[PDB]
Amino acid sequence: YTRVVWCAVGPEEQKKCQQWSQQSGQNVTCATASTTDDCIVLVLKGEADALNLDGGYIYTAGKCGLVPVLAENRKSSKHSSLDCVLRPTEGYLAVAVVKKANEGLTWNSLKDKKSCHTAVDRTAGWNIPMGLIVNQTGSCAFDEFFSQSCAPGADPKSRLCALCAGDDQGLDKCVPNSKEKYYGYTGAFRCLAEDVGDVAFVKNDTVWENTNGESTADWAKNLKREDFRLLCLDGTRKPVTEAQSCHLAVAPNHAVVSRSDRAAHVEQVLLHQQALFGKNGKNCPDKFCLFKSETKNLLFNDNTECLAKLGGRPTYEEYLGTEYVTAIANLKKCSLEACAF
Ligand SMILES: *[C@@H]1O[C@H](CO)[C@@H](O[C@@H]2O[C@H](CO)[C@@H](O)[C@H](O)[C@H]2NC(C)=O)[C@H](O)[C@H]1NC(C)=O
Ligand SMILES: *[C@@H]1O[C@H](CO)[C@@H](O[C@@H]2O[C@H](CO)[C@@H](O)[C@H](O)[C@H]2NC(C)=O)[C@H](O)[C@H]1NC(C)=O
Ligand SMILES: CC1(C)Cc2c(-c3ccccc3)c(-c3ccc(Cl)cc3)c(CC(=O)O)n2C1
Ligand SMILES: *[C@@H]1O[C@H](CO)[C@@H](O)[C@H](O)[C@H]1NC(C)=O
Ligand SMILES: [Fe+3]
Ligand SMILES: [Zn+2]
Ligand SMILES: [Zn+2]
């Protein structure tokens, strides 16, 4: 009765989870909710066991008692002797991306421009840039900084949702799941690509993976890396090959979380499921690939090489790092340490 009930966020994740469930012979089954917060609630009620989360959502789950279990680990350079499951994670770079042709937009002229964010509460798309912005402006009024935005999860009538597009029928505008056209890393970068916004807060890998033919999706297939610049905190603009010297932060990798009392079982089941369906898996590309979903980053980021063991049985605070947790705490003061639910 180590069936693990995964929580899928929206219908496209639910469809992938259903295929995973079928292929796993119901070793894994699926609960679904409309939002990441709602999935965390199902886990707190014991109606789902686990899901994989961005760091800002790990902060929410962690305040309510849930614990990190395994982390996404993507390709690396050095440390290459180690098996992926054992290799330390390296964090990803949160960046602010603009079009080269939008000349003289820099970090210091962002006020009153249009912004694209992966979702409220997420690390690169929200906590890092809005925390930096609140700090730099000396003001908690971050909902009045950009003239319009798409920030999935904000009030859909507010200017923080004015750029969001909803689903193809145009329903579900601004919902924080993949139905919203501009949701997530891929959606916020598409929001910039399509010039709906002036700036997208995403990570370094997003720009690479959706330019120069790395994506064949209709909106991405013609994008050229050279037509984008990163915004540096010192006011300069750099090419996207320079993200090691022009990022807003290094983010902790997305990780699986669960109730502490289920962490051990969730871990062993996931280790076995990735041996089947993960990057070199017995049954991938054969039957099912757990870490593919045609660039849509459903359940896991498509660039995940494996889910890796954590060193030191970390608490969510240790996993996130004290400085990130403190930055989050500070930003949340704009809108005392109990579970949000
Ligand atoms: C930014 O992201 C890109 C995409 O993940 C990284 O480029 C990949 O890096 C490895 C080398 O580590 C190459 O083998 C891959 O083939 C690259 N992918 C692509 C699409 O080019 C890049 O290294 C990252 N930059 C920084 C500074 O972290
Ligand atoms: C925004 O500013 C706050 C206030 O300075 C930052 O909070 C401090 O962070 C440092 C470095 O971790 C700690 O030494 C201080 O104790 C923190 N101060 C407080 C009052 O808690 C926060 O890191 C900043 N946000 C961002 C995104 O950089
Ligand atoms: C295993 C972690 C989830 C803990 C952690 C810290 C961390 C933890 C404790 C105290 C400080 C940092 C930092 C990290 C790395 C670099 C910067 Cl500039 C900021 C944070 C990173 C990203 C990285 O791998 O380099 N991680 C990943
Ligand atoms: C299902 O779970 C059992 C128990 O670990 C295991 O023997 C079997 O290999 C698993 N099968 C699949 C298809 O995940
Ligand atoms: Fe993230
Ligand atoms: Zn840095
Ligand atoms: Zn510890």
Side-chain angles (χ1 to χ4, degrees):
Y1 292 123
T2 212
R3 275 186 13 189
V4 171
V5 178
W6 204 255
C7 199
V9 182
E12 290 179 324
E13 284 208 343
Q14 174 183 35
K15 167 171 180 20
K16 183 174 164 172
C17 190
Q18 286 170 168
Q19 290 166 358
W20 182 11
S21 177
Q22 180 156 25
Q23 308 285 329
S24 69
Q26 334 287 116
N27 287 344
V28 174
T29 53
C30 299
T32 304
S34 287
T35 74
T36 299
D37 286 346
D38 286 352
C39 266
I40 286 165
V41 173
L42 295 182
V43 183
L44 292 165
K45 301 193 283 163
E47 292 178 25
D49 287 321
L51 66 170
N52 174 65
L53 294 183
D54 167 75
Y57 292 140
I58 291 165
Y59 175 92
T60 298
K63 290 235 152 198
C64 299
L66 300 188
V67 296
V69 174
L70 293 167
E72 284 186 1
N73 225 341
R74 88 204 145 267
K75 317 305 188 276
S76 178
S77 287
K78 208 178 135 197
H79 267 133
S80 64
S81 306
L82 282 181
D83 180 71
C84 180
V85 178
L86 298 173
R87 147 159 42 90
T89 63
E90 288 183 80
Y92 48 99
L93 300 177
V95 293
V97 193
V98 297
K99 288 296 195 48
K100 182 167 69 170
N102 201 340
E103 305 175 30
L105 185 51
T106 76
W107 184 257
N108 299 307
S109 57
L110 277 175
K111 191 174 171 29
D112 301 319
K113 309 290 193 307
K114 289 182 275 169
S115 65
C116 306
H117 302 259
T118 50
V120 175
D121 284 358
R122 285 189 55 166
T123 293
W126 184 264
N127 290 340
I128 291 306
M130 301 307 101
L132 289 166
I133 289 161
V134 163
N135 287 5
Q136 296 179 11
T137 69
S139 177
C140 275
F142 62 69
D143 65 315
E144 282 175 357
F145 185 80
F146 297 110
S147 49
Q148 291 174 298
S149 311
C150 178
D155 178 1
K157 66 183 180 296
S158 67
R159 70 165 83 171
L160 285 166
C161 287
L163 303 184
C164 287
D167 74 9
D168 44 30
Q169 284 203 264
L171 267 42
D172 269 351
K173 184 213 170 41
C174 218
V175 294
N177 70 46
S178 67
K179 284 317 278 186
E180 154 65 46
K181 195 179 190 168
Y182 304 136
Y183 174 72
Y185 291 125
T186 291
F189 186 60
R190 175 192 190 158
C191 167
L192 174 71
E194 286 182 350
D195 299 310
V196 171
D198 293 305
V199 61
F201 296 108
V202 299
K203 63 175 163 171
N204 160 65
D205 316 77
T206 307
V207 184
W208 299 77
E209 292 167 2
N210 295 276
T211 48
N212 293 38
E214 295 290 316
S215 167
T216 58
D218 67 336
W219 63 269
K221 74 174 168 185
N222 268 316
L223 297 182
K224 297 311 188 143
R225 264 159 222 156
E226 244 300 304
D227 293 334
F228 296 89
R229 293 286 186 258
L230 303 178
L231 297 193
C232 321
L233 285 165
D234 68 359
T236 63
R237 302 157 48 96
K238 294 194 197 330
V240 303
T241 52
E242 308 311 301
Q244 210 159 189
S245 64
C246 185
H247 49 257
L248 307 189
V250 179
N253 281 346
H254 293 204
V256 176
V257 303
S258 75
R259 275 175 28 170
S260 172
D261 70 22
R262 290 289 289 154
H265 271 300
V266 168
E267 179 180 337
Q268 66 178 63
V269 167
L270 286 174
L271 295 171
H272 184 73
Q273 293 297 310
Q274 69 174 358
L276 303 172
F277 304 118
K279 163 108 185 316
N280 271 316
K282 284 186 157 70
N283 302 325
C284 162
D286 218 4
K287 290 160 181 264
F288 179 70
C289 293
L290 191 54
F291 307 134
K292 290 324 208 327
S293 42
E294 277 85 311
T295 79
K296 304 170 49 135
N297 293 320
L298 301 181
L299 304 177
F300 303 96
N301 286 308
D302 295 335
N303 73 351
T304 303
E305 182 194 356
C306 72
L307 293 171
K309 300 164 139 192
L310 310 175
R313 291 227 184 203
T315 69
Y316 84 90
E317 293 192 328
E318 291 177 311
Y319 181 75
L320 290 183
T322 304
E323 212 142 87
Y324 184 45
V325 158
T326 304
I328 303 158
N330 267 303
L331 174 63
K332 276 178 158 73
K333 292 171 165 31
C334 299
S335 48
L336 229 78
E337 75 271 4
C339 178
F341 311 109

PDB file of all heavy atoms in Angstrom, residues 139-161:
ATOM      1  N   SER A 139       9.167  50.478  -1.294  1.00  0.00           N
ATOM      2  CA  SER A 139       7.703  50.507  -1.312  1.00  0.00           C
ATOM      3  C   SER A 139       7.084  49.135  -1.464  1.00  0.00           C
ATOM      4  O   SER A 139       7.494  48.395  -2.360  1.00  0.00           O
ATOM      5  CB  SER A 139       7.185  51.383  -2.461  1.00  0.00           C
ATOM      6  OG  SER A 139       5.743  51.333  -2.505  1.00  0.00           O
ATOM      7  N   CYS A 140       6.058  48.836  -0.657  1.00  0.00           N
ATOM      8  CA  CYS A 140       5.311  47.576  -0.773  1.00  0.00           C
ATOM      9  C   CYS A 140       4.268  47.585  -1.886  1.00  0.00           C
ATOM     10  O   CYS A 140       3.569  46.592  -2.093  1.00  0.00           O
ATOM     11  CB  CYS A 140       4.608  47.232   0.536  1.00  0.00           C
ATOM     12  SG  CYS A 140       5.678  46.356   1.675  1.00  0.00           S
ATOM     13  N   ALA A 141       4.120  48.718  -2.567  1.00  0.00           N
ATOM     14  CA  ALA A 141       3.152  48.821  -3.641  1.00  0.00           C
ATOM     15  C   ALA A 141       3.664  48.169  -4.993  1.00  0.00           C
ATOM     16  O   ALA A 141       3.510  48.743  -6.066  1.00  0.00           O
ATOM     17  CB  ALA A 141       2.741  50.286  -3.825  1.00  0.00           C
ATOM     18  N   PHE A 142       4.231  46.951  -4.937  1.00  0.00           N
ATOM     19  CA  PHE A 142       4.667  46.231  -6.155  1.00  0.00           C
ATOM     20  C   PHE A 142       3.558  45.919  -7.190  1.00  0.00           C
ATOM     21  O   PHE A 142       3.837  45.407  -8.280  1.00  0.00           O
ATOM     22  CB  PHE A 142       5.310  44.891  -5.746  1.00  0.00           C
ATOM     23  CG  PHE A 142       4.356  43.970  -5.039  1.00  0.00           C
ATOM     24  CD1 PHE A 142       3.288  43.371  -5.728  1.00  0.00           C
ATOM     25  CD2 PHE A 142       4.478  43.753  -3.684  1.00  0.00           C
ATOM     26  CE1 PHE A 142       2.389  42.576  -5.076  1.00  0.00           C
ATOM     27  CE2 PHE A 142       3.596  42.900  -3.037  1.00  0.00           C
ATOM     28  CZ  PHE A 142       2.537  42.345  -3.719  1.00  0.00           C
ATOM     29  N   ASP A 143       2.297  46.167  -6.837  1.00  0.00           N
ATOM     30  CA  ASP A 143       1.174  45.946  -7.742  1.00  0.00           C
ATOM     31  C   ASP A 143       0.872  47.185  -8.575  1.00  0.00           C
ATOM     32  O   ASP A 143      -0.043  47.184  -9.411  1.00  0.00           O
ATOM     33  CB  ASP A 143      -0.061  45.553  -6.939  1.00  0.00           C
ATOM     34  CG  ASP A 143      -0.535  46.666  -6.039  1.00  0.00           C
ATOM     35  OD1 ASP A 143       0.312  47.295  -5.370  1.00  0.00           O
ATOM     36  OD2 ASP A 143      -1.752  46.911  -6.025  1.00  0.00           O
ATOM     37  N   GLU A 144       1.633  48.224  -8.316  1.00  0.00           N
ATOM     38  CA  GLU A 144       1.571  49.502  -9.029  1.00  0.00           C
ATOM     39  C   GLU A 144       2.897  49.863  -9.728  1.00  0.00           C
ATOM     40  O   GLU A 144       3.060  50.972 -10.242  1.00  0.00           O
ATOM     41  CB  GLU A 144       1.251  50.593  -7.993  1.00  0.00           C
ATOM     42  CG  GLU A 144      -0.210  50.606  -7.631  1.00  0.00           C
ATOM     43  CD  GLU A 144      -0.587  51.575  -6.515  1.00  0.00           C
ATOM     44  OE1 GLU A 144       0.283  52.261  -5.905  1.00  0.00           O
ATOM     45  OE2 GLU A 144      -1.803  51.616  -6.251  1.00  0.00           O
ATOM     46  N   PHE A 145       3.856  48.955  -9.715  1.00  0.00           N
ATOM     47  CA  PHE A 145       5.154  49.219 -10.351  1.00  0.00           C
ATOM     48  C   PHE A 145       5.148  49.075 -11.861  1.00  0.00           C
ATOM     49  O   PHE A 145       5.564  50.021 -12.596  1.00  0.00           O
ATOM     50  CB  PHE A 145       6.262  48.350  -9.714  1.00  0.00           C
ATOM     51  CG  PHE A 145       7.651  48.643 -10.230  1.00  0.00           C
ATOM     52  CD1 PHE A 145       8.385  49.733  -9.758  1.00  0.00           C
ATOM     53  CD2 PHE A 145       8.225  47.803 -11.209  1.00  0.00           C
ATOM     54  CE1 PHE A 145       9.656  49.993 -10.231  1.00  0.00           C
ATOM     55  CE2 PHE A 145       9.500  48.033 -11.665  1.00  0.00           C
ATOM     56  CZ  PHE A 145      10.225  49.118 -11.182  1.00  0.00           C
ATOM     57  N   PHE A 146       4.700  47.919 -12.344  1.00  0.00           N
ATOM     58  CA  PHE A 146       4.550  47.712 -13.805  1.00  0.00           C
ATOM     59  C   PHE A 146       3.155  48.231 -14.217  1.00  0.00           C
ATOM     60  O   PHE A 146       2.193  48.204 -13.408  1.00  0.00           O
ATOM     61  CB  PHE A 146       4.729  46.268 -14.177  1.00  0.00           C
ATOM     62  CG  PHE A 146       6.100  45.775 -13.857  1.00  0.00           C
ATOM     63  CD1 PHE A 146       6.293  44.863 -12.836  1.00  0.00           C
ATOM     64  CD2 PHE A 146       7.181  46.174 -14.661  1.00  0.00           C
ATOM     65  CE1 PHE A 146       7.576  44.370 -12.583  1.00  0.00           C
ATOM     66  CE2 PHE A 146       8.463  45.676 -14.441  1.00  0.00           C
ATOM     67  CZ  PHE A 146       8.680  44.810 -13.368  1.00  0.00           C
ATOM     68  N   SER A 147       3.073  48.804 -15.406  1.00  0.00           N
ATOM     69  CA  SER A 147       1.781  49.334 -15.840  1.00  0.00           C
ATOM     70  C   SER A 147       0.771  48.226 -16.023  1.00  0.00           C
ATOM     71  O   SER A 147      -0.425  48.391 -15.662  1.00  0.00           O
ATOM     72  CB  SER A 147       1.882  50.209 -17.099  1.00  0.00           C
ATOM     73  OG  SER A 147       2.627  49.568 -18.076  1.00  0.00           O
ATOM     74  N   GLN A 148       1.219  47.117 -16.611  1.00  0.00           N
ATOM     75  CA  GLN A 148       0.390  45.934 -16.754  1.00  0.00           C
ATOM     76  C   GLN A 148       1.310  44.712 -16.675  1.00  0.00           C
ATOM     77  O   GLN A 148       2.488  44.807 -16.992  1.00  0.00           O
ATOM     78  CB  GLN A 148      -0.270  45.885 -18.101  1.00  0.00           C
ATOM     79  CG  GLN A 148      -1.337  46.971 -18.281  1.00  0.00           C
ATOM     80  CD  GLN A 148      -1.827  46.910 -19.701  1.00  0.00           C
ATOM     81  OE1 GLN A 148      -1.061  47.114 -20.613  1.00  0.00           O
ATOM     82  NE2 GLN A 148      -3.063  46.548 -19.897  1.00  0.00           N
ATOM     83  N   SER A 149       0.777  43.590 -16.254  1.00  0.00           N
ATOM     84  CA  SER A 149       1.525  42.339 -16.227  1.00  0.00           C
ATOM     85  C   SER A 149       0.670  41.130 -16.527  1.00  0.00           C
ATOM     86  O   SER A 149      -0.592  41.209 -16.502  1.00  0.00           O
ATOM     87  CB  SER A 149       2.018  42.131 -14.781  1.00  0.00           C
ATOM     88  OG  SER A 149       2.637  43.290 -14.284  1.00  0.00           O
ATOM     89  N   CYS A 150       1.327  39.996 -16.769  1.00  0.00           N
ATOM     90  CA  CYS A 150       0.685  38.755 -16.548  1.00  0.00           C
ATOM     91  C   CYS A 150       1.375  38.088 -15.384  1.00  0.00           C
ATOM     92  O   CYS A 150       2.585  37.710 -15.486  1.00  0.00           O
ATOM     93  CB  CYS A 150       0.658  37.816 -17.802  1.00  0.00           C
ATOM     94  SG  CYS A 150      -0.109  36.183 -17.500  1.00  0.00           S
ATOM     95  N   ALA A 151       0.665  37.935 -14.280  1.00  0.00           N
ATOM     96  CA  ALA A 151       1.244  37.255 -13.128  1.00  0.00           C
ATOM     97  C   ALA A 151       0.210  36.244 -12.601  1.00  0.00           C
ATOM     98  O   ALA A 151      -0.594  36.650 -11.750  1.00  0.00           O
ATOM     99  CB  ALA A 151       1.619  38.232 -12.021  1.00  0.00           C
ATOM    100  N   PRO A 152       0.171  35.064 -13.192  1.00  0.00           N
ATOM    101  CA  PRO A 152      -0.840  34.027 -12.908  1.00  0.00           C
ATOM    102  C   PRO A 152      -0.998  33.840 -11.381  1.00  0.00           C
ATOM    103  O   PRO A 152       0.001  33.804 -10.622  1.00  0.00           O
ATOM    104  CB  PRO A 152      -0.307  32.812 -13.661  1.00  0.00           C
ATOM    105  CG  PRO A 152       0.339  33.422 -14.923  1.00  0.00           C
ATOM    106  CD  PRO A 152       1.068  34.610 -14.316  1.00  0.00           C
ATOM    107  N   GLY A 153      -2.234  33.777 -10.925  1.00  0.00           N
ATOM    108  CA  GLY A 153      -2.494  33.716  -9.448  1.00  0.00           C
ATOM    109  C   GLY A 153      -2.865  35.064  -8.802  1.00  0.00           C
ATOM    110  O   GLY A 153      -3.330  35.072  -7.642  1.00  0.00           O
ATOM    111  N   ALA A 154      -2.695  36.203  -9.496  1.00  0.00           N
ATOM    112  CA  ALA A 154      -3.110  37.526  -8.917  1.00  0.00           C
ATOM    113  C   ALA A 154      -4.636  37.706  -9.188  1.00  0.00           C
ATOM    114  O   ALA A 154      -5.228  36.852  -9.826  1.00  0.00           O
ATOM    115  CB  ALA A 154      -2.297  38.739  -9.463  1.00  0.00           C
ATOM    116  N   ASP A 155      -5.224  38.809  -8.733  1.00  0.00           N
ATOM    117  CA  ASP A 155      -6.695  39.058  -8.979  1.00  0.00           C
ATOM    118  C   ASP A 155      -6.900  39.266 -10.486  1.00  0.00           C
ATOM    119  O   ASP A 155      -6.293  40.154 -11.096  1.00  0.00           O
ATOM    120  CB  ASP A 155      -7.075  40.296  -8.173  1.00  0.00           C
ATOM    121  CG  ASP A 155      -8.530  40.707  -8.352  1.00  0.00           C
ATOM    122  OD1 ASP A 155      -9.290  40.071  -9.064  1.00  0.00           O
ATOM    123  OD2 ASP A 155      -8.889  41.713  -7.772  1.00  0.00           O
ATOM    124  N   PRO A 156      -7.766  38.460 -11.124  1.00  0.00           N
ATOM    125  CA  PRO A 156      -7.864  38.571 -12.582  1.00  0.00           C
ATOM    126  C   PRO A 156      -8.394  39.933 -13.086  1.00  0.00           C
ATOM    127  O   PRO A 156      -8.143  40.295 -14.255  1.00  0.00           O
ATOM    128  CB  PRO A 156      -8.776  37.426 -12.970  1.00  0.00           C
ATOM    129  CG  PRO A 156      -9.424  36.974 -11.677  1.00  0.00           C
ATOM    130  CD  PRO A 156      -8.454  37.255 -10.590  1.00  0.00           C
ATOM    131  N   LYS A 157      -8.996  40.744 -12.209  1.00  0.00           N
ATOM    132  CA  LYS A 157      -9.397  42.041 -12.705  1.00  0.00           C
ATOM    133  C   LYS A 157      -8.306  43.074 -12.512  1.00  0.00           C
ATOM    134  O   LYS A 157      -8.470  44.238 -12.947  1.00  0.00           O
ATOM    135  CB  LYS A 157     -10.722  42.545 -12.044  1.00  0.00           C
ATOM    136  CG  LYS A 157     -10.618  42.833 -10.545  1.00  0.00           C
ATOM    137  CD  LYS A 157     -12.036  43.245 -10.003  1.00  0.00           C
ATOM    138  CE  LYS A 157     -11.952  43.538  -8.501  1.00  0.00           C
ATOM    139  NZ  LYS A 157     -11.579  42.288  -7.764  1.00  0.00           N
ATOM    140  N   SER A 158      -7.202  42.713 -11.853  1.00  0.00           N
ATOM    141  CA  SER A 158      -6.150  43.719 -11.525  1.00  0.00           C
ATOM    142  C   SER A 158      -5.180  43.892 -12.653  1.00  0.00           C
ATOM    143  O   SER A 158      -5.145  43.061 -13.589  1.00  0.00           O
ATOM    144  CB  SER A 158      -5.321  43.282 -10.266  1.00  0.00           C
ATOM    145  OG  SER A 158      -4.594  42.143 -10.582  1.00  0.00           O
ATOM    146  N   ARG A 159      -4.380  44.964 -12.580  1.00  0.00           N
ATOM    147  CA  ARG A 159      -3.449  45.177 -13.701  1.00  0.00           C
ATOM    148  C   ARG A 159      -2.336  44.113 -13.650  1.00  0.00           C
ATOM    149  O   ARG A 159      -1.687  43.855 -14.671  1.00  0.00           O
ATOM    150  CB  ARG A 159      -2.805  46.571 -13.625  1.00  0.00           C
ATOM    151  CG  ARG A 159      -1.860  46.665 -12.483  1.00  0.00           C
ATOM    152  CD  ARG A 159      -0.944  47.888 -12.576  1.00  0.00           C
ATOM    153  NE  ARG A 159      -1.515  49.144 -12.083  1.00  0.00           N
ATOM    154  CZ  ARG A 159      -0.807  50.275 -11.934  1.00  0.00           C
ATOM    155  NH1 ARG A 159       0.487  50.322 -12.222  1.00  0.00           N
ATOM    156  NH2 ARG A 159      -1.381  51.368 -11.456  1.00  0.00           N
ATOM    157  N   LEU A 160      -2.152  43.432 -12.501  1.00  0.00           N
ATOM    158  CA  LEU A 160      -1.175  42.292 -12.530  1.00  0.00           C
ATOM    159  C   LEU A 160      -1.629  41.118 -13.411  1.00  0.00           C
ATOM    160  O   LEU A 160      -0.830  40.218 -13.744  1.00  0.00           O
ATOM    161  CB  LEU A 160      -0.876  41.795 -11.057  1.00  0.00           C
ATOM    162  CG  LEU A 160       0.000  42.649 -10.226  1.00  0.00           C
ATOM    163  CD1 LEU A 160      -0.069  42.253  -8.716  1.00  0.00           C
ATOM    164  CD2 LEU A 160       1.392  42.407 -10.827  1.00  0.00           C
ATOM    165  N   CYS A 161      -2.935  41.046 -13.808  1.00  0.00           N
ATOM    166  CA  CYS A 161      -3.443  39.993 -14.729  1.00  0.00           C
ATOM    167  C   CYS A 161      -3.797  40.544 -16.080  1.00  0.00           C
ATOM    168  O   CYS A 161      -4.211  39.803 -16.954  1.00  0.00           O
ATOM    169  CB  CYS A 161      -4.747  39.313 -14.166  1.00  0.00           C
ATOM    170  SG  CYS A 161      -4.367  38.213 -12.744  1.00  0.00           S
TER     171      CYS A 161
END
